[PDB]
Amino acid sequence: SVPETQVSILDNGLRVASEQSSHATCTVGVWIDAGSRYETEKNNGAGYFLEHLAFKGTKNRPGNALEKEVESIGAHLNAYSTREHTAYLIKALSKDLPKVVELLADIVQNSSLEDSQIEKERDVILREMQENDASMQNVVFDYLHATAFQGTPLAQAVEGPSENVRRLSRTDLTDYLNRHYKAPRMVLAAAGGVEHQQLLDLAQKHLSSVSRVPCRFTGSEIRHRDDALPLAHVAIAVEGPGWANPDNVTLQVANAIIGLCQSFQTFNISYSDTGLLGAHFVCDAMSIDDMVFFLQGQWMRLCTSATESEVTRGKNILRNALVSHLDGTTPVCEDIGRSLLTYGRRIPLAEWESRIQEVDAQMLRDICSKYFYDQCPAVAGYGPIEQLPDYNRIRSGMFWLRF
Amino acid sequence: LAIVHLLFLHETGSNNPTGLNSDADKIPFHPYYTIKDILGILIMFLILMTLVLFFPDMLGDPDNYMPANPLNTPPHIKPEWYFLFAYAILRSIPNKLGGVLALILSILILALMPFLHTSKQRSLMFRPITQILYWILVANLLILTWIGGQPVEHPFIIIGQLASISYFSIILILMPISGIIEDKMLKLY
Numbered sequence: 001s002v003p004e005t006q007v008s009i010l011d012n013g014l015r016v017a018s019e020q021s022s023h024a025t026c027t028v029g030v031w032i033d034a035g036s037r038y039e040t041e042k043n044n045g046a047g048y049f050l051e052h053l054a055f056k057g058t059k060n061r062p063g064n065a066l067e068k069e070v071e072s073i074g075a076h077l078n079a080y081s082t083r084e085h086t087a088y089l090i091k092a093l094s095k096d097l098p099k100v101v102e103l104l105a106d107i108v109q110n111s112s113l114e115d116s117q118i119e120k121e122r123d124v125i126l127r128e129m130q131e132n133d134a135s136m137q138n139v140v141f142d143y144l145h146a147t148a149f150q151g152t153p154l155a156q157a158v159e160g161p162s163e164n165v166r167r168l169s170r171t172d173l174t175d176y177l178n179r180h181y182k183a184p185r186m187v188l189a190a191a192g193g194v195e196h197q198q199l200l201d202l203a204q205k206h207l208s209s210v211s212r213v214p215c216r217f218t219g220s221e222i223r224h225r226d227d228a229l230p231l232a233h234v235a236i237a238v239e240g241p242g243w244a245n246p247d248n249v250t251l252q253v254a255n256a257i258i259g260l261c262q263s264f265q266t267f268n269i270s271y272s273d274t275g276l277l278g279a280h281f282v283c284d285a286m287s288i289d290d291m292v293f294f295l296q297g298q299w300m301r302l303c304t305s306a307t308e309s310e311v312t313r314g315k316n317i318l319r320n321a322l323v324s325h326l327d328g329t330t331p332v333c334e335d336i337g338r339s340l341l342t343y344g345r346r347i348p349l350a351e352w353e354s355r356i357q358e359v360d361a362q363m364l365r366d367i368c369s370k371y372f373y374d375q376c377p378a379v380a381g382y383g384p385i386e387q388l389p390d391y392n393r394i395r396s397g398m399f400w401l402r403f
Numbered sequence: 404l405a406i407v408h409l410l411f412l413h414e415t416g417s418n419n420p421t422g423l424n425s426d427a428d429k430i431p432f433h434p435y436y437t438i439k440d441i442l443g444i445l446i447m448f449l450i451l452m453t454l455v456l457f458f459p460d461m462l463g464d465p466d467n468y469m470p471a472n473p474l475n476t477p478p479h480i481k482p483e484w485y486f487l488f489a490y491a492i493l494r495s496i497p498n499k500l501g502g503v504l505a506l507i508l509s510i511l512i513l514a515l516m517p518f519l520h521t522s523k524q525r526s527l528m529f530r531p532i533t534q535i536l537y538w539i540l541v542a543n544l545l546i547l548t549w550i551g552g553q554p555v556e557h558p559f560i561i562i563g564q565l566a567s568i569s570y571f572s573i574i575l576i577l578m579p580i581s582g583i584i585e586d587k588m589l590k591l592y
């Protein structure tokens with residue numbers, strides 16, 4: 001009984017997708033297939049710095065008058081950038097649907113990058129990075145990406161190195177903007193109280209101008225030892241399947257089974273036919289090795305001794321999860337934008353439920369043995385990590401002598 | 404006693420060839436120094452089995468294959484080769500008692516060794532003069548091993564007497580003085 005997500009396509013290739021609902025406020029966003037993976041180490045912070053500059057005024061709406069408009073209807077303006085996708089989204093009322101779309105049009109095209117602003121946003125970005133190091137789990141996940149995807153464009157961070165940040169100019173930005181903002185790589189997603197025909201007419205009216213035009217995991221280890229920190233963050237991952245491979249669903253159930261360290265989180269990060277599947281835990285130094293041992297045992301148990309009850313529990317946790325999420329308008333629009341960018345279509349919740357209920361214990365331990373057993377992991381540690389075991393002990397913990 | 408030897412060591416951990424505090428760089432033993440010990444065991448077994456299966460009497464004495472005759476004395480009496488250095492020293496000292504004592508000291512001088520360390524650096528990796536003195540010590544230890552074999556006659560005796568004098572003077576006198584000189588060269592003393 002969930003309403004279907006209807007997708008149309010303009011000549012430009014900008015797929016305009018919408019999923020109407022009763023709620024009177026909507027989350028209209030633009031999703032662009034452009035991240036740090038498309039950068040070539042000479043413009044490693046171009047997407048981040050453009051994400052900073054995108055709200056500082058356009059040609060038609062110069063400066064803060066633009067954001068005065070998004071204050072005037074009381075709407076909320078957000079943007080984010082990952083290694084593969086960039087999103088500019090607005091939460092607003094339903095009756096303010098046209099102007100919001102027009103605002104989004106300016107943000108993607110006709111944007112103005114002021115040289116004055118460029119210096120101010122450089123100091124913002126530089127400073128934030130200079131303090132970003134504070135967030136450990138971000139440092140650990142960046143270290144994990146770097147050591148797992150050495151030599152590839154997937155190792156480099158979204159923010160880029162301070163070097164590039166300082167060394168960036170309007171023209172470079174202009175390039176990234178004019179290169180990675182093509183209309184066939186763009187989705188206009190709407191969720192909530194929107195009509196699809198009105199949104200399609202608004203996309204035809206504005207946004208109809210957008211121009212139309214080997215990933216490798218390396219089993220490795222990075223250890224940033226700094227003994228003055230009170231807690232240690234350790235992430236261990238193996239290679240993921242990618243977006244389009246359905247056993248992701250089964251792997252999600254495996255994560256739902258795992259769900260000793262103060263904080264233990266499992267992740268399945270997916271990129272275009274690659275990814276990182278693993279666990280991040282933050283712990284006191286004198287516990288670290290025991291955690292690792294614990295964690296590896298659970299993975300091998302999922303490779304060898306999965307039972308039906310924990311599989312049923314993981315399926316229930318996954319169902320609830322995906323359905324708990326996909327609740328508010330934003331979460332949904334976000335799903336529409338990512339689904340049109342990655343799968344090329346919006347997968348409905350009934351298909352997700354079918355793919356969940358076809359998962360049993362035998363195929364779960366088969367897929368877990370395919371992806372976890374006897375695999376070389378990527379390890380990233382930060383903090384008092386002397387008792388964190390080196391690569392032979394972790395690699396030996398990636399299998400059992402008793403199977 | 405070897406179990407006590409291992410205990411008195413783990414309290415302090417093993418040393419490294421640079422002689423520095425290796426606390427910043429330590430690794431496990433199971434996968435790194437176990438396969439290394441297994442490889443060393445294999446090489447030692449290779450040398451032991453090529454000593455047993457190919458040259459089983461190159462280190463022993465032929466006269467041990469005769470039965471023990473109390474009436475017949477051999478023309479030349481030796482212990483087995485690893486006692487030779489001591490044998491030389493014993494023979495060198497004219498006095499019987501002196502020989503016995505020196506002999507004992509030969510082994511005991513080692514125990515005395517931790518009180519003779521006068522350098523601010525633990526290892527000899529960065530100490531070339533004491534390296535030269537150490538290899539001269541290994542050299543005249545080999546000389547004393549050879550002399551023991553040689554019979555009692557000129558000039559084997561004199562070498563034995565000198566070699567023993569040089570052995571005790573290098574261990575007792577020359578190495579701490581050299582360590583003081585090496586500390587003076589680094590502007591430490």
Ligand SMILES: CCCCCCCCCCCCCCCCCC(=O)OC[C@H](COP(=O)(O)OCCN)OC(=O)CCCCCCCCCCCCCCCCC
Binds near residue numbers: 539
């Ligand atoms: C030494 C004079 C300077 C030599 C300079 C050589 C060139 C150095 C610059 C070019 C680089 C060449 C290669 C360098 C390798 C490393 C540096 C080096 O080897 O230095 C020379 C070496 C150590 O020199 P160092 O400790 O700094 O001071 C010399 C004190 N004589 O010292 C030596 O190499 C010479 C050591 C000679 C030892 C002779 C021992 C003879 C006695 C043996 C007795 C054995 C027992 C005999 C019987 C006893 C009982 C009777």
Ligand code: HEM
Binds near residue numbers: 405417419
């Ligand atoms: C009965 C024969 C012996 C056995 C089985 C034995 C056993 C061992 C073992 C297992 C170690 C640790 C591994 C190593 O560092 O090589 C060791 C180290 C050591 N042994 Fe022995 N040992 C023996 C004889 C001796 C003797 C005669 C001495 C004294 C001259 C000695 C002094 C040491 C020292 C000083 C170390 C520390 C090594 C270092 O940190 O540099 N051992 N021994």
